[PDB]
Amino acid sequence: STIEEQAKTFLDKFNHEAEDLFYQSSLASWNYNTNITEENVQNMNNAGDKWSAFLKEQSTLAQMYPLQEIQNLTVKLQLQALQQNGSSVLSEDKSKRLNTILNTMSTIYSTGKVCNPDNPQECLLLEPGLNEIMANSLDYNERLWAWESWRSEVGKQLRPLYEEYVVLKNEMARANHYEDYGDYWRGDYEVNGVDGYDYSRGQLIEDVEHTFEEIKPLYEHLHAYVRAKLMNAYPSYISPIGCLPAHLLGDMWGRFWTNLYSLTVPFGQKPNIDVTDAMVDQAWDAQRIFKEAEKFFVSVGLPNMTQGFWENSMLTDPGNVQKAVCHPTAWDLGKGDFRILMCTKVTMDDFLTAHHEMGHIQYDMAYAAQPFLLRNGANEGFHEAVGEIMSLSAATPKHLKSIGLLSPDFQEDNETEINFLLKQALTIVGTLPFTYMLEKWRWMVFKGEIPKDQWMKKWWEMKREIVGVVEPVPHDETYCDPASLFHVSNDYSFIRYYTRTLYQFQFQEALCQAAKHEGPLHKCDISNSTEAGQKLFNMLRLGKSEPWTLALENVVGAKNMNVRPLLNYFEPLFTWLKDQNKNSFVGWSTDWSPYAD
Amino acid sequence: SNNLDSKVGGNYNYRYRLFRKSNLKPFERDISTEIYQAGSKPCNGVEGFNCYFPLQSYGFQPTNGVGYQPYRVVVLSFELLHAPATVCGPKKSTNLV
Incomplete structure (x- = not known):
């Protein structure tokens, strides 16, 4: 009758056809990851x-349905995915040149290596060599050579490639009604046509800026603590009031202080929570580690797994002749067929990783009944944020004592809680401003505020102000540090780590109140609380059919990122970092560098 | 019938109607291939803008789930009319004393 029948009919045609065709690529990817062969990679x-190709052919009809006078949110969101042309707005030469840049940038980044100045015959590759130098090795000279040489050999070569990547991407985004490709990434959270839950694209810029200043009281105290500990190991280079060198952060890109745990132990005499020895004595294996993990998911009140879920999953590497990808990955093959790939071992690192990947399945299985175009997460934050809250609760010793891995006689005291809690802040608090740093810099580059010659000049300036980090050697205009990151060279968004980080504690606070946990969140344990998993599934089943702000309003009590549940998690840590910083300066001083004189 | 009727790539011999200009009646059947019209323009026997071919094939693959797998369904309707009974159940018996 009306025009409304066209969209409701066309989407059902696409939701019928795009369903089976998409699964053919997913199961083809499953076959390749399970058996890396020249035959499977071709079908993939x-x-x-x-x-x-089917997505682009279908856009001819998606564009003939104006969404101007339409209020149906289901019709708007589905057709908007197909109405966008993306890379099809430019000519084949510009689109192909873009992929030639990304393919070349990924090769230069992947094949990077550094030979020692005293051993020209021993070059260490990006993985596993140089990652071990920044993570495991404590030698000052080795950490410096791996950092500065990486910037000159890999950073400089990616600078001219990153120029073409920005200008080509900006033309694509601007053709699709955006300000730049920076705003294109911000469009993941856009909401239009809903009263009281709308969300502008550029609103993410004020959100990360607002939450950043609220993180600073917790970050400035941790920055002084790690600086004081690293100063004792490197006193001839680190001042007690200056900045932290960039080559002593724990990685080749300066993202996580997790590798600096050995140098920043709160109490090296007290024990930690680890059930590695407890599991092997009980004769646990990859299946039992997965099976008892399911009891936690059923104990909270979430749906259990299907018989085909465990039967068709991967638990180890089936020989070198048919070597599989041992990386943890939660797979949605479709038609209710869900699986996980993991080479699981008997260790606590795989115990929590199993809950992490199983949490990803709970996300996808919840909204699996939605239409195909709406059978996806509302945003990248919701996809990965829900994965960590289930593993962090399992890591709580209260759950281990109930399962029986951690013995009941294991004492718990404020001293041991700081060993675990401070270890997380090095990962969370030591990374939150770093993600805000990179995306703020990149967002200014896509918009064009920083000239192409002033990339290294402004990058060093932002490092001293935001994070309080300095390079080990001065870099001229020819260097490009953030281009040497995996997420940057491969056209990936890094803002999701900031959003996922704060959303993780937000959802955790909502469930801890559901499970009735008192005190800080670090001792929270939603295990054996049927109301916890029940309230979560009400949010997981929404998918992307409603605004993400609506999901946060009725669950975590907010419509955007917030730092309140972060300080609640690290509440006693703020008292510990304060006590440790009594003999040092809180924050940082931009006038200090390791090469100063 | 997932172990019986499913085929690699979907059993295209089993199909069903997705759209119809009107609702069916009890025990009604219709195998017409008329294009479902929504707008005022004629479809000209081809689907597209405000036109859609109503029948579509099933995705009965061996990897389907409990909700998507094929189910051999049979409906047994009983009729009690003025005419005499033509079908009944079996009656019990025993030995002969």
Whole structure:
């Protein structure tokens, strides 16, 4: 009758056809990851190209339905995914040149290596060599050579490639009604046509800026603590009031202080929570580690797994002849067929990783009944944020004592809680301003506020102001540090880590109140609380059919990122970092550098 | 019938109607291939803008789930009319004393 029948009919046609075609690429990817062969990789790319071509052919009808006078949110969100042309707005030469840049940038980043100045015959590759130098090795000279040489050999070569990547991407985004490709990433959270829950694209810029200043009281105290500990190991280079060198952060990109735990132990005499020895004595294996993990998911009140879920999953590497990808990955093959790939071992690192990947399945299985275009997460934050809250609760010793891995006689005191709690802040608090740093710099580059010659000049300036970090050697205009990151060279968004980080504690606070936990969140344990998993599933089942702000309003009590549950998690840590910083300066001083004289 | 009727790539011999200009009646059947019209323009026998071919094939693959797998369904309707009974159940018996 009306025009409304066209969209409701066209989407059902696409939701019928795009369903099976997309799964052919997913199961083709499953076959490749389970058996890396020249035969499976061809079907993987052919299946993706087949489905990818179907998406563009279908856009001819998606664009003939104006969404101007339409109020149906279901019709708008689904057609908007197909109405966007993306890379199809430019000519084949510009689109192909873009992929040639990304393919070349990924190769230069992947094949990077550094030989020692005294051993020209021993070059260490990006993985596993140089990552071990920044993570495990404590030698000042080795950490410096791996950092500065990486910037000159890999950073400089990616600078001219990153220039073409920005200008080509900006033309694509601007053609799709955006300000720049920086705003394109911000469009993941956009909401239009809903009263009281709308969300502008550029609103993410004020949100990260607002939450950043609220993180600073917790970050400035941790920055002085790690600086004081690293100063004792490197007193001839680190001042007690200056900045932290960039090559002593724990990685080749300066993102996590997790590798600095050995140098920043609160109490090296007291024990930690670890059930590695407890599991092997009980004769646990990859299946039992997965099975008892399911009891936690059922104990909270979430749906259990299907018989085909465990039967078709991967638990180890089936030989070198059919070597599989041992990386943890939660797979949605479709038609209710969900699986996980993991080479699980008997250790606590795999105990929590299993809950992490299983949490990803709970996300996808919840909204699996939605339409195909709406069978996806509302945003990248919700996808990965829900994964960590289930593993962090399992890491709580209260759950281990109930399961029986951690013995009941294991004492718990404020001293041991700081050993675990401070270890997380090095990962969370030591990374939150760093993600805000990179995306703020990149967002200014896509918009064009920083000239292409002033990339290294402003990058060093932002490092001293935001994070309080300085390079080990001065870099001229020819260097490009953030281009040497994996997420940057491969056209990936890094803002999701900031959003996922704060959303993680937000959802945790909502469930801890549901499970009735008193005190800080670090001792929270939602295990054996049927109301906890029940309230979560009400949010997981929404998918992307409603605004993400609506999901946060009725669950965590907010419509955007917030730092309140972060300080609640690290509440006693703020008292510990304060006590440790009594003999040092809180914050940082931009006038100090390791090469100063 | 997932172990019986499913096929690699979907059993295209089993199909069903997705759209119809009107609702069916009890025990009604219709196998027409008329294009479902929504707008005022004629479809000209082809689907597209405000036009859609109503029938579509099933995705009965061996990897389907409990909700998507094929189920051999049979409906047994009983009729009690003025005409005499033509079908009944079996009656019990025993030995002969």
